[PDB]
Design a protein around this nucleic acid. Structure first.
Lengths: 122, 81, 135, 80, 87
RNA sequence: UAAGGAACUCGGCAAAAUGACCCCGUAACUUCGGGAGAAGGGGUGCUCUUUAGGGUUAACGCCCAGAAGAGCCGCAGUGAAU
RNA sequence: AUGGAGAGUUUGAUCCUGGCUCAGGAUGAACGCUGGCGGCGUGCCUAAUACAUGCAAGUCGAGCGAACGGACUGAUGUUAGCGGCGGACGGGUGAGUAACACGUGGAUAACCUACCUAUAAGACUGGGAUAACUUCGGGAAACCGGAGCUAAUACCGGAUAAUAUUUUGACGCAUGGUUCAAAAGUGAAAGACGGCUGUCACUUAUAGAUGGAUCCGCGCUGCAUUAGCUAGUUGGUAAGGUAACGGCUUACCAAGGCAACGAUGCAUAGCCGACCUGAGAGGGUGAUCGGCCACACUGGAACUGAGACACGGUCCAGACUCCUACGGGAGGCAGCAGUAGGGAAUCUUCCGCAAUGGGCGAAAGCCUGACGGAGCAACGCCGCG
RNA sequence: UACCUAAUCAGAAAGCCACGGCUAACUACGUGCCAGCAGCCGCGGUAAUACGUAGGUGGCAAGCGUUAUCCGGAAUUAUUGG
């Protein structure tokens, strides 16, 4: 359950090492988000270099959360850390790799380049 | 890479490694048993020492240990005996 | 000094500061570092083409060009000859040699080279000032 | 064969079975030619440390003993 | 092992050779042990060869092994003959 | 008390968190005393082997402390309170 | 004796002092204008940047088992494999390194060494497997795992054997040395021949040669606006392990050790023979050739091996680049050419093992981008137009 | 492929820089402190051997000049040698 003022790790090589969120897109009054949902956020720790630099405002997608998700069969997938990936306003990543596991529910959101450039779909 | 000679050399290396490590493992077991029997002066010290000197010189012939290393182990064992 | 003073403090010669420093430095774009190269010539981009007034004893409008070399160094270079075809964003080859009148111009643009034409009417001294053998 | 021999002065005997021997020699200047005195400290072994600070002793080299010593004490001739 | 061989010392299409005792692992024109003699195959008619006798027989007794053409050169001086006489 | 962690609020008010002892580390700045417990790291249970120490002494024995090993057990060993 | 040139410029004019500039010789040079030839050389100095594509390390069927395959019993091949040797050489680069790295001179009574040579003694007796092959499964490749057989100079167990180790008596500090007289325990092969033996495989001892290893004196950059550096540090005592001495490592003792004769730190750098310049003294430099060192995408580690902690070997981590059926896999031009990039700037994706050298083989032979030659460039020297 | 031997043709094979003094090589024209040149001294303001061109000259020549860097000249780190 991700709301504004929540710090997330970036799971990509965009430059951003860790970021926090401002809004959850998707509706007036929308308050929370889970895997497959986009958020506006501003990086707080960047790598020296990288395409994204510290203090920028960026669109981003949640790829793993500690709250996790119910699946239609009564199966639940949970994780040990929140995480996110930056996007280029086309459901495409800004970086060239992607670190760590990803949840299968991103397949539906048509974040296919995120699902294709991933260590483990789950 | 993968020159034909190199690809074969990997197979004969692990083959030699398996034979080699088994032999020095048997040696080091004998050497430890030989010097632990000498320390408490057990009745079986002499042939255990002879078993250790036998295995030490057999491996020094296999180039498992250097010849000069065999003498240090051998000199150590018989001196304590 | 005495021999003992010389033994304790051996003679120190003066260092030679060389003219045209920007030809003695290279660049490494991978490591973002400056190197030492001692180049005969360097190639740069003209960021400004204009005319400079000379020193007080002389009086003549002298053409020059602000050139950013292969290094991250911005120098001023003379344009020998009568006519030149250089504007902004012109690739030039810059050699050593300063202009005595012009204060702040320590280099010369080589005419008849990469993206720099020679002197149109030059007939004796075509090695310098560019331009090929007429007929 | 023959191992080199040096004669120097004991400048340190604060360590057991070890003394420091100061072998002062001369080195001329390459350019000016004046001979300049320079000294070199040698760490030498002596199982029976009979050398005391101020003695001129005889030093001969040997195989490496400890991290620094490469010399043994041959002869002690001074009393100080 | 130790080989008695020839080292090229000539310019383009004008080779000159020294008879040299050297290790087999050493480069052809590189490290050597002893120079024995010379070999000039482009001289007037017969290739002029110069070989020492004391060192050449010293290295042969020490186990140095001549190459194919140093064998020929040592034979034209009878060196291989006298090496054979002392069985 | 799930997930988030000052987004509440005039203000982190209140609450939460650190806390003991031992070892290691500790900056700028200074009136040279300080800053300072600065900051920032690590350990603490139990049993056995071993064997220094000095305290009363005639000695047994009684006190109060050390060091090195080898184990054992729990989620957690200044297992609570301060 | 074989070797030493100056000139311009401060002033109204002068003599000093003093700086600046020029005339000379050079370069791995580049650029501009030109350009006939030949012979010797030289040719990525920058990004130790990234690499498409070809080749750069194989050989021995006389070590031996093949589904072997197959002239004609089958010559011959190696299809494929086991085994031996080689892959630690040769070739490349100068990133790192201010150090016993390098040069020079020594020492090792603190040291290892396959092949090669010589001398001796030998090479006895048994055993169990497994590659290959057949047949089942997996897996998208890469490959992996089951059963059933088969050899060897593959492997293993006993016999015997030294100057091998332990205990014995008869110098230069650690000692060295060769007699003694006991104890334990250390091997091996066959192949192809000729009438038992020859050749070349082997094993053990010695020596020689070769190649390595360590230690030491001296020499070897700049900065003091870098002054105090270290705590295995420095010495000792034990133990371990190393081819070998040694704080090399670990415990316990003591507080030691280096330093204005420049400890330490920072920056820079492969070193040398040698090259350029100079009358010389000196100053600058470390392209090509040769010796040494270090490195192999970055970083750790060991295995095999006489020798590697290994450029065209292995494992792991990292950064990249590629394949994937998403579970997993593959790669390393600072070898020769060559491409992209950077740069002012540096070449053919050539021929041959004909010679010399190297590996393997009894040899014929095979491999060799070493090397010998060709292609391009006035890049240089020389010679002729 | 070097290389040699026969025919044949002066035919297919020179350019670069300088010329004020250092420093070998001077005149005319154009311009008129402009255009420009320059290593230094400096030149160019209607009669420049200093700028551009033309003749001539001189230095080299399959090369000639410029730039980059080192030594010399520099006794301008002087030990030789302040």
């Amino acid at each position: 359950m991700i709301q504004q003022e929540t710090r997330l790790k970036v799971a990509d090589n965009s430059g951003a090492r860790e970021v926090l969120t401002i809004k959850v897109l998707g509706g007036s009054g929308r308050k929370t988000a889970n895997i497959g949902d986009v958020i506006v956020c501003t990086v707080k720790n960047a790598t020296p270099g990288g395409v994204v630099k510290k203090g920028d405002v960026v669109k981003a997608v949640i790829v793993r959360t500690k709250s996790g998700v119910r699946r239609n069969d009564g199966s639940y997938i949970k994780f040990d850390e929140n995480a996110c990936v930056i996007i280029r306003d086309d459901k495409g990543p800004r970086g060239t790799r992607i670190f760590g596991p990803v949840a299968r529910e991103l397949r539906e959101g048509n974040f296919m380049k995120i699902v294709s450039l991933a260590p483990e779909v789950l | 890479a993968n020159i034909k000679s190199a690809i074969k050399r990997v197979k004969t290396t692990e083959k030699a490694e398996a034979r080699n490590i088994s032999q020095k493992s048997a040696m080091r077991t004998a050497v430890k048993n030989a010097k632990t029997a000498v320390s408490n002066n057990a009745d079986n010290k002499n042939e255990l020492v002879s078993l250790a000197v036998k295995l030490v010189d057999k491996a020094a012939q296999s180039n498992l240990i250097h010849s000069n290393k065999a003498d240090r182990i051998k000199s150590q064992l018989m001196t304590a005996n | 000094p005495t021999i003992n003073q010389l033994v304790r403090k051996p003679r120190q010669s003066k260092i030679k500061k060389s003219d045209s420093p920007a030809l003695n430095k290279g660049f490494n774009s991978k490591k973002k570092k400056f190197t030492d190269l001692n180049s005969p010539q360097k190639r740069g981009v003209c960021t400004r083409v204009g005319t400079m007034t000379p020193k007080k004893p002389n009086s003549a409008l002298r053409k020059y060009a602000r050139v950013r070399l292969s290094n991250n160094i911005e120098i001023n270079a003379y344009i020998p000859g009568i006519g030149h075809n250089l504007q902004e964003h012109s690739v030039v080859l810059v050699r050593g040699g300063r202009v005595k009148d012009l204060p702040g111009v320590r280099y010369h643009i080589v005419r008849g080279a990469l993206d720099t034409s020679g002197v149109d009417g030059r007939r004796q001294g075509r090695s310098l000032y560019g331009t090929k053998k007429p007929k | 064969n023959d191992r080199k021999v040096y004669v120097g002065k004991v400048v340190s005997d604060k360590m057991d079975k070890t003394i420091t021997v100061l072998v002062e020699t001369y080195k001329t200047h390459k350019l000016y030619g004046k001979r300049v005195k320079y000294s070199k400290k040698y760490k030498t072994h002596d199982e029976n440390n009979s050398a005391k600070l101020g003695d001129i002793v005889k030093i001969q080299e040997t195989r490496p003993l400890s991290a620094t010593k490469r010399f043994r004490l041959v002869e002690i001739v001074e009393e100080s | 092992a130790v080989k008695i061989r020839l080292t090229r010392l000539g310019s383009k299409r004008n080779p000159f050779y020294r008879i040299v005792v050297a290790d087999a692992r050493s480069p052809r024109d590189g490290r050597i042990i002893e120079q024995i003699g010379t070999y000039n195959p482009t001289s007037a008619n017969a290739p002029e060869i110069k070989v020492d006798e004391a060192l050449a027989l010293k290295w042969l007794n020490d186990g140095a092994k001549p190459t194919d053409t140093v064998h020929n050169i040592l034979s034209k001086e009878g060196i291989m003959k006298k090496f054979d006489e002392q069985k």
